[PDB]
Ligand binder design. Sequence first.
Ligand SMILES: Nc1ncnc2c1ncn2[C@@H]1O[C@H](COP(=O)(O)OP(=O)(O)O)[C@@H](O)[C@H]1O
Ligand SMILES: Nc1ncnc2c1ncn2[C@@H]1O[C@H](COP(=O)(O)OP(=O)(O)O)[C@@H](O)[C@H]1O
Ligand SMILES: Nc1ncnc2c1ncn2[C@@H]1O[C@H](COP(=O)(O)OP(=O)(O)O)[C@@H](O)[C@H]1O
Ligand SMILES: Nc1ncnc2c1ncn2[C@@H]1O[C@H](COP(=O)(O)OP(=O)(O)O)[C@@H](O)[C@H]1O
Ligand SMILES: Nc1ncnc2c1ncn2[C@@H]1O[C@H](COP(=O)(O)OP(=O)(O)O)[C@@H](O)[C@H]1O
Ligand SMILES: Nc1ncnc2c1ncn2[C@@H]1O[C@H](COP(=O)(O)OP(=O)(O)O)[C@@H](O)[C@H]1O
Ligand SMILES: Nc1ncnc2c1ncn2[C@@H]1O[C@H](COP(=O)(O)OP(=O)(O)O)[C@@H](O)[C@H]1O
Ligand SMILES: Nc1ncnc2c1ncn2[C@@H]1O[C@H](COP(=O)(O)OP(=O)(O)O)[C@@H](O)[C@H]1O
Ligand SMILES: [Mg+2]
Ligand SMILES: [Mg+2]
Ligand SMILES: [Mg+2]
Ligand SMILES: [Mg+2]
Ligand SMILES: [Mg+2]
Ligand SMILES: [Mg+2]
Ligand SMILES: [Mg+2]
Ligand SMILES: [Mg+2]
Ligand SMILES: [Mg+2]
Ligand SMILES: [Mg+2]
Ligand SMILES: [Mg+2]
Ligand SMILES: [Mg+2]
Ligand SMILES: [Mg+2]
Ligand SMILES: [Mg+2]
Ligand SMILES: [Mg+2]
Ligand SMILES: [Mg+2]
Ligand SMILES: [Mg+2]
Ligand SMILES: [Mg+2]
Ligand SMILES: [Mg+2]
Ligand SMILES: [Mg+2]
Ligand SMILES: [Mg+2]
Ligand SMILES: [Mg+2]
Ligand SMILES: [Mg+2]
Ligand SMILES: [Mg+2]
Ligand SMILES: [Mg+2]
Ligand SMILES: [Mg+2]
Ligand SMILES: [Mg+2]
Ligand SMILES: [Mg+2]
Lengths: 149, 146, 149, 146, 149, 146, 149, 146
Amino acid sequence: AFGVEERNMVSGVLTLAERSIRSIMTPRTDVSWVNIDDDAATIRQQLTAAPHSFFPVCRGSLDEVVGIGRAKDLVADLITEGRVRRNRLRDPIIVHESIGILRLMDTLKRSRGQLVLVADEFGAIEGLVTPIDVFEAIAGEFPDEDELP
Amino acid sequence: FGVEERNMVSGVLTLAERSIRSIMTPRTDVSWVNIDDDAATIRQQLTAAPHSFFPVCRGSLDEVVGIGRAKDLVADLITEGRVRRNRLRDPIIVHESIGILRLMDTLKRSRGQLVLVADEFGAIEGLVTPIDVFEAIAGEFPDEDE
Amino acid sequence: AFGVEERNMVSGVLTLAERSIRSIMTPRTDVSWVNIDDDAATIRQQLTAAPHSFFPVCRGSLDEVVGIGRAKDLVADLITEGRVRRNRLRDPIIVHESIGILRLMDTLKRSRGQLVLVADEFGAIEGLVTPIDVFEAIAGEFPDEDELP
Amino acid sequence: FGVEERNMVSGVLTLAERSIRSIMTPRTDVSWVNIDDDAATIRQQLTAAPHSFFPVCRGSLDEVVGIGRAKDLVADLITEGRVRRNRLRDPIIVHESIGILRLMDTLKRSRGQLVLVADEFGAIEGLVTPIDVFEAIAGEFPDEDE
Amino acid sequence: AFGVEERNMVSGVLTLAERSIRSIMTPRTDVSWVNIDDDAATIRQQLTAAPHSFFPVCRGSLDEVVGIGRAKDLVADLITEGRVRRNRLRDPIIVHESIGILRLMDTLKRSRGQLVLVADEFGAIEGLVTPIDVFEAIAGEFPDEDELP
Amino acid sequence: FGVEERNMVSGVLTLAERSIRSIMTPRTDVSWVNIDDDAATIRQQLTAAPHSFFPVCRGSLDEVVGIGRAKDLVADLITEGRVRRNRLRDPIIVHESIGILRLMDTLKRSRGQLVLVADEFGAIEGLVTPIDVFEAIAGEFPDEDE
Amino acid sequence: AFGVEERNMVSGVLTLAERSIRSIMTPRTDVSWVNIDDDAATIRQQLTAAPHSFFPVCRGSLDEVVGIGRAKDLVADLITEGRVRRNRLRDPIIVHESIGILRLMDTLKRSRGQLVLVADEFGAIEGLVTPIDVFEAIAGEFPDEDELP
Amino acid sequence: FGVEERNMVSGVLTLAERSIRSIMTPRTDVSWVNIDDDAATIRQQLTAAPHSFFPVCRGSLDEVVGIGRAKDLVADLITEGRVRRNRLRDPIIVHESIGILRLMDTLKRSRGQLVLVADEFGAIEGLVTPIDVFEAIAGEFPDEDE
Ligand SMILES: Nc1ncnc2c1ncn2[C@@H]1O[C@H](COP(=O)(O)OP(=O)(O)O)[C@@H](O)[C@H]1O
Ligand SMILES: Nc1ncnc2c1ncn2[C@@H]1O[C@H](COP(=O)(O)OP(=O)(O)O)[C@@H](O)[C@H]1O
Ligand SMILES: Nc1ncnc2c1ncn2[C@@H]1O[C@H](COP(=O)(O)OP(=O)(O)O)[C@@H](O)[C@H]1O
Ligand SMILES: Nc1ncnc2c1ncn2[C@@H]1O[C@H](COP(=O)(O)OP(=O)(O)O)[C@@H](O)[C@H]1O
Ligand SMILES: Nc1ncnc2c1ncn2[C@@H]1O[C@H](COP(=O)(O)OP(=O)(O)O)[C@@H](O)[C@H]1O
Ligand SMILES: Nc1ncnc2c1ncn2[C@@H]1O[C@H](COP(=O)(O)OP(=O)(O)O)[C@@H](O)[C@H]1O
Ligand SMILES: Nc1ncnc2c1ncn2[C@@H]1O[C@H](COP(=O)(O)OP(=O)(O)O)[C@@H](O)[C@H]1O
Ligand SMILES: Nc1ncnc2c1ncn2[C@@H]1O[C@H](COP(=O)(O)OP(=O)(O)O)[C@@H](O)[C@H]1O
Ligand SMILES: [Mg+2]
Ligand SMILES: [Mg+2]
Ligand SMILES: [Mg+2]
Ligand SMILES: [Mg+2]
Ligand SMILES: [Mg+2]
Ligand SMILES: [Mg+2]
Ligand SMILES: [Mg+2]
Ligand SMILES: [Mg+2]
Ligand SMILES: [Mg+2]
Ligand SMILES: [Mg+2]
Ligand SMILES: [Mg+2]
Ligand SMILES: [Mg+2]
Ligand SMILES: [Mg+2]
Ligand SMILES: [Mg+2]
Ligand SMILES: [Mg+2]
Ligand SMILES: [Mg+2]
Ligand SMILES: [Mg+2]
Ligand SMILES: [Mg+2]
Ligand SMILES: [Mg+2]
Ligand SMILES: [Mg+2]
Ligand SMILES: [Mg+2]
Ligand SMILES: [Mg+2]
Ligand SMILES: [Mg+2]
Ligand SMILES: [Mg+2]
Ligand SMILES: [Mg+2]
Ligand SMILES: [Mg+2]
Ligand SMILES: [Mg+2]
Ligand SMILES: [Mg+2]
């Protein structure tokens, strides 16, 4: 009744509680984030080149997060107003890496499509996670358009 | 405790038995862009919906021209006053009968783009993304507007 | 002799004196304004994307109004000189929101096509108004190209 | 007082009786761009006139190619040395006999663009914007050069 | 043997010594100058939009002249190096407006195709002049591509 | 003194008697761009010469394709690796027999662009700008390399 | 058995030890270098316009070298992130001009395709060299795409 | 000492006797871009290899479409999602039998671009750059990955 795919997924589920958030998250070095101080042309190019829809919007560096922006809203602001509208950003959802995957899933269920940032106590961004990252731990890779197929 | 794992295992072991119809976003809930709408109408639709990809169609849902990314559509609508057809992505379309395991292989190859479910005559029955499959294993991940 | 359209317009006229400027003006959040400190490419994009012909030109923020610019003149300056020519701007016409619509109409008649800014005593811009905004209070919506039809 | 309201009400109640001819900017006062003029001539014309939209024509007013926004025309003239035809807006044109109430519906749909008034043979009789109708109700809103 | 054209030119010659440099020069407000602090895209656009070949290159404002640049050299620098190369600029030739046209002609003969700046004792640029400006005083207008024909 | 004026008046009164041949830059001194040269060669030629406008030709001077502005040619050569033909200006060409007064009217209409002097078979005899005429009245304004 | 080409190359080899690094290097004035403080559009244009693959990446001026960048990596960073990623740069290899060509060849053999900078004791960049520069001293010119053929 | 010079002189005096085959990068070691690969695959290939120029081919090495510069290919892959054919450089191709001296003349004219070595039927045998010739005189200049 069941085959290799199911067995692998069941194994995945039974190891979630042992794996770290660090092991599944998109790491700091691969975070795509918008520097609100960049010029409109630069940001616009970045938004179209990335496969992602939500972006931390920050002032000068990744750790200086002002909010989370939706690409489709950001592009509109940048074209018509020449800058990101700060008051249109969503509040970040942020967790510590130590909470583990089961607790993180509860948070992701409440995040309504928004990425979750992983940060230390001093506010340093360690990475970010979405439901896809957890699902991959169960069912295997769903690579982005700019990742190996 | 241990319940979350038990429930997820149960979910996995019933995947091959459930239909695509039972997990997909149904036709009635599809957000799609009518390329013949005026630009202000489409712009409003795009910001109001929570989704990032939209079928882009001429006049009705079944008349699919391509799949558009909202962030690209928005820029075109503002700078060109219309959706640029030649910027749209090719649709990925499956028949509902292929089952969830086969659909998962397709979704892995879709690289983030929604997959349309259509009959042999081209009628769109719904659409599906990896989240829809994940929900069958792990419970609901409600959209912003749900 | 008269029908629904006339009755509605007459009702509109007979309620002008009761309605506030706030209720008819384009509000602060929707003001399209040019930041004289932005680069030429950014401003040029903003001017072509907006349906409007006149723009407050400001230094760094909306409240820091230097003058009112005509898009067709601004585009020329930006292309040929790389910047807005400050000395070519028109002096702003500015009223307090409390003056009411009848008095505002007198001002609009004298403004010769230029938008009127609505500001508080401390110089904070609350909005802007043109004859179209008053006419809409009488005759119904005349939506811009980027507003719902 | 109360006079402003009385006068505006009187204006409203005589709208359906007045002709489009009586409120429009007449042919003799139309500012239009001759696409065959040299760039410096058109640039000067555009800055000197108070208007934002111009019929763009080949050789004479009746030979309308499209409607141009001054801010767009200016950029083309400087960067390309000529008016780009394919950037012009489609003209909106009515017959003078349709009356002011019907014209108002057209103006609401024109989204800021002037409406041309022309006869059946294409002769341009004048043009009209919402301001021209508003003046019939509320009195004059003189242009910069009036 | 001679007609209206000759008579007009002879009149022009016989009034040169009475006319001021101010009356023939391109005035300050119409000087096209490059701000070395502008970004490459802005300057490049300015150079192609202008009909002129030589440009004062200045730091922040017209009066802060660093040298005179040749458009064809400037464009090359801007594309390949992203900035104007200061050491490639030519030294400015500068006169006071009071020297009169006959003396200015001697200077123009020595300027080898380069525009001459007209400045006051405090270094404020009042305008610029080339042989065309003097010739126009004799023979009538030779308008630029962006001037009325 | 008074000599400068006397000499300039004498110059004016002999203009209608002098030939275009006698004031033009002769064929042998024409700087022209061979569109078939490699980009580095043309770039070097453009910086080395003092002139701003160049006939752009295919293989030989008489095979004129258009007139190019150095600042435009340079950008094309760097970004495209070649001269873009469709960016060139239309040549203005006169016969040497028209005389200086008529040539002056042409130069006034050329808006800064050099005028070519050619025979009926298309052979380029030289070129002329307002400076060449001015020199006939006022004495030499030597180029950087003269 | 041997002809003019061989004789010339042999002469070249027998004079290497007498020639200076200064005589073969690309001099300071012709170094193509990336200013990490420039905007993405400017740098991108510079990278495509130059025939070179490796570039010193510097902060504000050539002497302030942060590392050596590979064009293909830089372009990717600039498009997707809007800036050069400093941590992806290679460490510079730097020699003093006095070491002579034979010693420099040993260094070039170890540089694995990366250009070698020539600098004084105070860190002023005098030029840069690759194996092509040495080979030209033996076998004659191999001009770049933007150099005379 | 004096040995480096002696060895280099020996190298020079055996150039005309050595084959192109003996100095070229052989077919098996050619890095080439398959234009039909997906963008992420090509992007990874380009960053991983130490080389700057790549033959760009359709399906197999012999099906050469053009030569691409990595920095240009990368930009196209990110902005367009594919290699733009019309941006590629024309290949320079020689037969292995022409010998090293003649090849050096070709390399001097190639302006930095690799030269392909192919047979009369179009089979690519290898490729060569000035470094390959220099190594025959002066010893190895190993690539980053060698
Ligand atoms: N701004 C971002 N920067 C880096 N990675 C991101 C970003 N947003 C999403 N991701 C990653 O993209 C992958 C797919 O996640 P998904 O929820 O489908 O987002 P999206 O479709 O917006 O990329 C996940 O690995 C996720 O961690
Ligand atoms: N255009 C669309 N119309 C209707 N539902 C959609 C659309 N795009 C995605 N969905 C649904 O939204 C839910 C979340 O899917 P996800 O892949 O996160 O897409 P998104 O973030 O773009 O909404 C899924 O149930 C999916 O089927
Ligand atoms: N710079 C501006 N920013 C925001 N709204 C504006 C601006 N200029 C005009 N408007 C609004 O545009 C609408 C139409 O006004 P109108 O006088 O026709 O100006 P325009 O044609 O220049 O847009 C009115 O609601 C007016 O308040
Ligand atoms: N191109 C034009 N030629 C002549 N009159 C015009 C033109 N455009 C507008 N008008 C007139 O200018 C007056 C103000 O109209 P409005 O809609 O404010 O346009 P604008 O601000 O562009 O002049 C109206 O009487 C209108 O008919
Ligand atoms: N940088 C400049 N800014 C403004 N006017 C200029 C400039 N350079 C030349 N001119 C003006 O252009 C006109 C033609 O002069 P000319 O010597 O032919 O220069 P060019 O061909 O470079 O424009 C003259 O009126 C001259 O004063
Ligand atoms: N392409 C060219 N080849 C040869 N002579 C030229 C060329 N362009 C201009 N000249 C000559 O240069 C002199 C100065 O003319 P001018 O109009 O100032 O041009 P420019 O500043 O571009 O050299 C004149 O004698 C003119 O005939
Ligand atoms: N960034 C650079 N700036 C200036 N010259 C360079 C640079 N990189 C290489 N060169 C020069 O280019 C020529 C060819 O060297 P080569 O090793 O083939 O590098 P590339 O192919 O990257 O240009 C040599 O003269 C070398 O000194
Ligand atoms: N696309 C390629 N595939 C395989 N080898 C290459 C390629 N390009 C260059 N080479 C080899 O790399 C070595 C260094 O050559 P060089 O001209 O410095 O090129 P690069 O710096 O681009 O690798 C030479 O042996 C040359 O044959
Ligand atoms: Mg990513
Ligand atoms: Mg989602
Ligand atoms: Mg993962
Ligand atoms: Mg991934
Ligand atoms: Mg939905
Ligand atoms: Mg996704
Ligand atoms: Mg849902
Ligand atoms: Mg608006
Ligand atoms: Mg108006
Ligand atoms: Mg309103
Ligand atoms: Mg409105
Ligand atoms: Mg008028
Ligand atoms: Mg309007
Ligand atoms: Mg009027
Ligand atoms: Mg000028
Ligand atoms: Mg000159
Ligand atoms: Mg003059
Ligand atoms: Mg002039
Ligand atoms: Mg010459
Ligand atoms: Mg000139
Ligand atoms: Mg001369
Ligand atoms: Mg170089
Ligand atoms: Mg190399
Ligand atoms: Mg050398
Ligand atoms: Mg060289
Ligand atoms: Mg290799
Ligand atoms: Mg090379
Ligand atoms: Mg090797």
